[PDB]
Amino acid sequence: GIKVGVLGAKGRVGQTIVAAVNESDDLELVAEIGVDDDLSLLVDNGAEVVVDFTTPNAVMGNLEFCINNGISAVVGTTGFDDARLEQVRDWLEGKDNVGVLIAPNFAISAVLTMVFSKQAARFFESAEVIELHHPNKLDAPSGTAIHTAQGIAAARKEAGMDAQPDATEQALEGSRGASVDGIPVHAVRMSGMVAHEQVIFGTQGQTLTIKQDSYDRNSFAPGVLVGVRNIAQHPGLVVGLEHYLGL
Amino acid sequence: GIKVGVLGAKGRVGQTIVAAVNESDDLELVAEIGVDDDLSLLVDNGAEVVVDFTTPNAVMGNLEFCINNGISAVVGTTGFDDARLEQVRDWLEGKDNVGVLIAPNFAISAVLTMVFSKQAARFFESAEVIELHHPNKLDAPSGTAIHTAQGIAAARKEAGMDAQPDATEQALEGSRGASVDGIPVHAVRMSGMVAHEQVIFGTQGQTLTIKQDSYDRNSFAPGVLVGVRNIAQHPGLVVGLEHYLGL
Amino acid sequence: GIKVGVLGAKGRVGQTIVAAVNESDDLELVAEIGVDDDLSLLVDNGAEVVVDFTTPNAVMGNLEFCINNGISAVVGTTGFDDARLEQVRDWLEGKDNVGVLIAPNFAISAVLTMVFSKQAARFFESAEVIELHHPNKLDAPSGTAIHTAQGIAAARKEAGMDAQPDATEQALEGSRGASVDGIPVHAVRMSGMVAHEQVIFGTQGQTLTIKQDSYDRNSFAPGVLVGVRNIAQHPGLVVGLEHYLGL
Amino acid sequence: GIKVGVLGAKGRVGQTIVAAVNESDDLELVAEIGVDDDLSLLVDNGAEVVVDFTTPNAVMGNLEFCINNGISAVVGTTGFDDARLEQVRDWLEGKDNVGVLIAPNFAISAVLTMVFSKQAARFFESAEVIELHHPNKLDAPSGTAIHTAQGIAAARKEAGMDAQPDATEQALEGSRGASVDGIPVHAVRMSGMVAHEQVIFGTQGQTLTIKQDSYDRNSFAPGVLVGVRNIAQHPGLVVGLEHYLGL
Ligand SMILES: NC(=O)c1ccc[n+]([C@@H]2O[C@H](COP(=O)([O-])OP(=O)(O)OC[C@H]3O[C@@H](n4cnc5c(N)ncnc54)[C@H](OP(=O)(O)O)[C@@H]3O)[C@@H](O)[C@H]2O)c1
Numbered sequence: 001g002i003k004v005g006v007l008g009a010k011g012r013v014g015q016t017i018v019a020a021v022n023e024s025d026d027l028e029l030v031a032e033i034g035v036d037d038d039l040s041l042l043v044d045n046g047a048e049v050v051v052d053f054t055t056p057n058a059v060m061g062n063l064e065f066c067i068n069n070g071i072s073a074v075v076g077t078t079g080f081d082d083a084r085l086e087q088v089r090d091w092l093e094g095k096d097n098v099g100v101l102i103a104p105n106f107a108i109s110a111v112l113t114m115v116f117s118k119q120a121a122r123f124f125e126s127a128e129v130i131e132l133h134h135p136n137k138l139d140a141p142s143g144t145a146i147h148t149a150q151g152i153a154a155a156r157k158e159a160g161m162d163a164q165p166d167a168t169e170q171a172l173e174g175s176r177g178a179s180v181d182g183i184p185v186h187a188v189r190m191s192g193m194v195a196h197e198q199v200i201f202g203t204q205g206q207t208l209t210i211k212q213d214s215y216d217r218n219s220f221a222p223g224v225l226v227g228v229r230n231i232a233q234h235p236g237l238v239v240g241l242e243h244y245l246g247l
Numbered sequence: 248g249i250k251v252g253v254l255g256a257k258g259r260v261g262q263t264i265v266a267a268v269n270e271s272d273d274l275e276l277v278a279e280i281g282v283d284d285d286l287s288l289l290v291d292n293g294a295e296v297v298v299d300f301t302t303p304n305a306v307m308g309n310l311e312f313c314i315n316n317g318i319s320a321v322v323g324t325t326g327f328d329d330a331r332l333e334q335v336r337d338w339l340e341g342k343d344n345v346g347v348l349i350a351p352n353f354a355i356s357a358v359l360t361m362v363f364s365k366q367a368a369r370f371f372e373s374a375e376v377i378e379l380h381h382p383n384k385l386d387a388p389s390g391t392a393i394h395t396a397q398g399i400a401a402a403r404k405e406a407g408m409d410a411q412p413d414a415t416e417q418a419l420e421g422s423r424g425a426s427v428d429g430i431p432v433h434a435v436r437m438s439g440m441v442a443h444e445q446v447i448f449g450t451q452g453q454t455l456t457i458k459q460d461s462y463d464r465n466s467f468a469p470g471v472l473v474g475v476r477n478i479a480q481h482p483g484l485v486v487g488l489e490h491y492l493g494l
Numbered sequence: 495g496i497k498v499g500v501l502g503a504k505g506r507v508g509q510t511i512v513a514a515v516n517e518s519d520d521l522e523l524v525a526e527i528g529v530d531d532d533l534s535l536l537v538d539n540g541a542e543v544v545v546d547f548t549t550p551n552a553v554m555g556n557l558e559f560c561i562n563n564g565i566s567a568v569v570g571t572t573g574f575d576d577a578r579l580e581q582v583r584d585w586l587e588g589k590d591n592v593g594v595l596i597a598p599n600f601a602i603s604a605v606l607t608m609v610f611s612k613q614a615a616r617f618f619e620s621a622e623v624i625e626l627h628h629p630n631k632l633d634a635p636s637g638t639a640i641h642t643a644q645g646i647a648a649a650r651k652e653a654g655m656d657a658q659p660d661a662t663e664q665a666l667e668g669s670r671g672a673s674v675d676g677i678p679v680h681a682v683r684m685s686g687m688v689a690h691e692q693v694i695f696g697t698q699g700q701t702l703t704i705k706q707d708s709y710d711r712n713s714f715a716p717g718v719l720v721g722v723r724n725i726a727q728h729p730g731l732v733v734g735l736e737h738y739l740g741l
Numbered sequence: 742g743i744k745v746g747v748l749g750a751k752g753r754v755g756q757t758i759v760a761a762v763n764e765s766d767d768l769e770l771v772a773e774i775g776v777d778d779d780l781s782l783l784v785d786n787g788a789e790v791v792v793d794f795t796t797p798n799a800v801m802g803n804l805e806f807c808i809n810n811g812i813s814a815v816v817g818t819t820g821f822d823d824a825r826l827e828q829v830r831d832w833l834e835g836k837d838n839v840g841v842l843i844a845p846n847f848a849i850s851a852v853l854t855m856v857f858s859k860q861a862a863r864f865f866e867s868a869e870v871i872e873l874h875h876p877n878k879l880d881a882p883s884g885t886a887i888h889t890a891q892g893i894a895a896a897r898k899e900a901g902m903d904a905q906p907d908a909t910e911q912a913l914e915g916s917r918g919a920s921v922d923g924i925p926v927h928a929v930r931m932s933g934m935v936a937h938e939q940v941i942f943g944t945q946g947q948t949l950t951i952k953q954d955s956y957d958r959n960s961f962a963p964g965v966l967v968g969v970r971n972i973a974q975h976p977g978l979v980v981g982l983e984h985y986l987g988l
Pocket residue numbers: 007008009010011012013014033034035036053054055056058062075076077078103104105106107220
């Protein structure tokens with residue numbers, strides 16, 4: 001008895017959420033809204049939480065409906081700049097029984113990787129990020145690797161640390177990665193692979209590495225279920241799955 | 248200007264602490280007590296924190312001296328059962344300017360590995376620990392791997408989770424590791440290696456792995472310096488380096 | 495202009511071979527035989543090599559047809575005990591223009607892993623095999639890990655080596671893996687994973703590890719194309735993809 | 742009863758060879774020549790193989806002596822350009838009982854890594870090299886990583902392969918490594934680490950990785966003992982430890 005609706009129920013990601021919800025013991029799928037269905041269906045079937053993987057063009061309207069009918073929302077749809085977040089916050093004002101989670105990344109293991117990398121960064125002199133993807137990826141490095149590096153660098157700055165140890169004299173071009181706020185980032189492009197990351201931290205005598213591996217590109221359901229299960233404790237707007245992790 | 252003394256200054260680990268202290272910018276080595284030197288030296292030279300890597304036979308006396316002369320202490324020496332911890336706590340009663348840290352493990356990367364493994368364990372169905380050591384190691388699995396497994400299992404229990412997914416019918420003896428509170432633990436014994444650990448967590452579509460690697464057996468100084476630097480914020484007795492990590 | 499037929503063209507594996515053949519520049523798909531089609535189609539369309547992923551019940555008949563019409567064959571279908579191999583060898587007697595490759599494993603990376611593990615084993619004192627699979631796998635350890643261990647052990651015996659270094663006193667049950675001809679084998683069962691193997695070899699100061707990773711269970715086409723491309727240099731029966739690798 | 746002399750017996754590497762020889766069962770240390778000892782000692786004590794880790798200034802004289810007294814030689818000393826190799830070959834002419842091995846790298850695991858990388862390269866579309874070292878290393882990438890990349894690229898060219906798959910549009914500077922004959926090479930500089938390499942190969946559905954790890958910088962003895970043990974089967978000059986591996 002969490003009654004759950006899914007917007008974008010027939011999309012690439014939405015299907016996996018319908019499946020996940022059907023497998024669970026505690027969640028009941030009361031509505032599957034695709035592009036042509038009225039949202040009033042969520043009201044009728046008494047949805048309490050909704051999960052949204054739709055489009056940037058649809059999501060603000062739908063979200064406004066949900067919030068205005070008292071339904072909490074777990075939103076994976078992208079496109080949320082500051083102005084849009086300010087819009088969601090404005091709608092939520094004075095509504096203590098409604099929560100919204102906007103998570104630009106729902107891959108629970110990518111998220112824990114960023115969280116743990118930030119916590120570790122205080123304690124090690126050296127930090128590098130290696131990212132590996134299928135060779136059709138256009139952008140290098142990946143957005144996740146850029147974010148991870150920026151998080152480490154902000155952690156290091158907050159702890160007042162030095163920039164890092166390195167005796168390299170005239171490294172060849174490219175050998176030392178892309179420098180992102182002082183953190184080397186290396187991007188590997190490899191047939192057979194999907195999406196992977198390694199953060200390697202180093203200090204006297206030892207290292208710590210945090211590795212993230214996706215064996216396929218449609219594994220958002222564990223993160224989304226963390227959202228659905230916990231949103232009743234997070235009234236108002238929360239941005240980022242990390243804030244639901246209880247860390 | 249943290250004036251620091253080292254007890255066991257000539258021992259295997261103590262030397263590395265003397266070195267580390269000498270390299271630093273903020274810590275001044277005012278005393279190096281070996282087995283035949285009076286501890287009053289710490290009083291004379293105005294030691295404020297002491298670091299102890301001595302023996303279980305020496306440490307209680309020395310610690311009692313330090314605490315009774317108002318010197319805080321960072322203790323790596325082993326042998327601290329409950330009764331001994333109760334003794335240290337009794338001595339510290341009503342002494343708001345004295346801190347003691349007793350850390351059964353000062354390898355900052357082993358410690359962060361246990362901490363992060365506990366935090367991650369809520370979120371993944373599968374969890375296994377692989378530990379790898381030089382082949383002269385007597386005990387298998389390692390104490391660190393046992394502790395890590397017990398921490399994961401306590402985390403899982405606290406989150407009310409199931410025991411883990413596995414369709415294995417009549418696994419061969421030994422193939423699935425040693426079960427430690429329900430967590431498989433595999434011990435590899437390998438020439439060339441030192442001490443290494445991997446915690447692998449798994450859920451739909453993805454994994455997270457935390458790897459610890461020691462490239463040699465005398466890398467306790469980063470953890471100990473975390474102790475020395477922070478003990479002024481931890482009056483009383485703290486047991487475990489994790490509690491100094493600000494997590 | 496290698497004209498290629500595929501038997502089992504509509505099966506799980508056969509489809510991937512049809513696809514691969516269609517993508518190539520040098521191979522022309524002249525026939526796709528499923529269960530209800532006459533094999534004479536291969537003769538009509540002038541097939542020169544055939545690829546077989548069918549069933550153990552079909553394969554001997556089909557293969558006999560191919561060989562008797564002078565068509566060479568790359569066979570992935572399983573079920574080939576000694577008596578069946580002796581049957582294939584008997585049919586091939588005195589037929590210098592016909593080749594058959596029977597490969598119990600067509601995953602080019604699993605095969606190179608076994609080959610390289612055998613070659614390395616002479617030179618290292620320590621050798622262990624770690625295998626990791628999705629947690630629905632029934633058998634532990636995997637057949638590939640068993641074969642890999644047996645290959646290492648045969649290599650070691652051939653080089654007259656000792657059994658391996660290890661100071662372990664009363665290891666806990668299961669901690670040291672399943673012993674397979676003296677090689678420890680550890681099986682990890684992990685949500686998110688597919689099929690992976692690591693062979694770790696160790697000696698003074700160093701290790702060598704060979705890792706195999708499958709990101710999905712339908713990646714036999716690279717190996718099969720090695721077969722199709724090279725079978726014209728391997729008249730007669732060859733068993734095992736390794737013998738086509740030019741090593 | 743292989744009587745063995747060591748030139749440079751008191752040097753960093755020579756000591757480890759003296760140790761190794763003393764531990765063995767089959768080799769007898771009959772001479773330890775340092776800088777001030779006559780080489781005639783090798784003749785007196787009936788040395789049959791000599792191991793040389795000295796200096797580029799000493800080695801040609803010493804080697805000429807050894808060869809002219811019929812003693813075979815396993816030479817790790819560096820400095821051997823073509824002209825010097827031509828000199829060694831000239832001295833060895835018509836001397837069927839004398840062998841010399843000049844090995845620019847004696848780390849058995851680095852060598853097997855290059856050998857296996859060359860053999861694998863025919864079969865995979867994607868190939869990258871990641872190298873990791875202590876952060877005092879001056880040069881990036883490492884010489885071993887450069888050599889490994891050049892070997893892969895020569896293998897690929899010999900097999901007539903394409904250059905590699907990659908959809909990357911305007912990668913950031915440095916993100917894709919240093920291109921070495923078309924093979925990406927990434928150099929990581931990390932406190933705690935020693936010297937490590939990974940060659941990652943990729944094709945549809947799968948990868949193969951070969952990892953080399955040194956846990957300390959003085960692990961040449963296994964390779965050198967391969968030399969000493971086998972040199973009696975390699976009369977004349979051989980350059981490179983790989984040629985002694987029986988591959
Ligand atoms: N971690 C993350 O946060 C994460 C991960 C993956 C994807 N995403 C984002 O999630 C969104 C969906 O991605 P996807 O890969 O699932 O795309 P998709 O397969 O295109 O699915 C979008 C679905 O929403 C439906 N839709 C459009 N307007 C709608 C409306 N008003 N009400 C209900 N359904 C509507 C679509 O139907 P029509 O075809 O008729 O429009 C389609 O089934 C994208 O913005 C993507 O960027 C986020």
